[PDB]
Amino acid sequence: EECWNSMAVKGRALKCFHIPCVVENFPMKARTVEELKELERVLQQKKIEAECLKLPNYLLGSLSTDFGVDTSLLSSQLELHSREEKINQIILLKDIIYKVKTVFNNEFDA
């Protein structure tokens, strides 16, 4: 129960037919409703921040743009001066990790 009901995407391997190459998926746990709710909350928060306001990868310090993950909602690394801002960026980066893993796991399932 503890191993298998927790993983929404189970830890799976893919072996080549003749090459000794093994590709493993990201063994996700179940993405919680709390996690989806903070996803949507920070999505609209950064969307209205960008609307009120209305860049290279290394100033952001991330290569998550290589996997199609929207990282324009990340606050700048030079502007994370407050506790709430750094906590918001922490949970944004957790979600961005899950998004990169989701892109790779879709390719893995293909």
């Binding site: 994370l80 506790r83 750094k86 906590i87």
Partner: peptide, 10 residues
Amino acid sequence: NLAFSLLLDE
């Protein structure tokens, strides 16, 4: 690195 400057301020 961002759970780091939260609490130095505290």
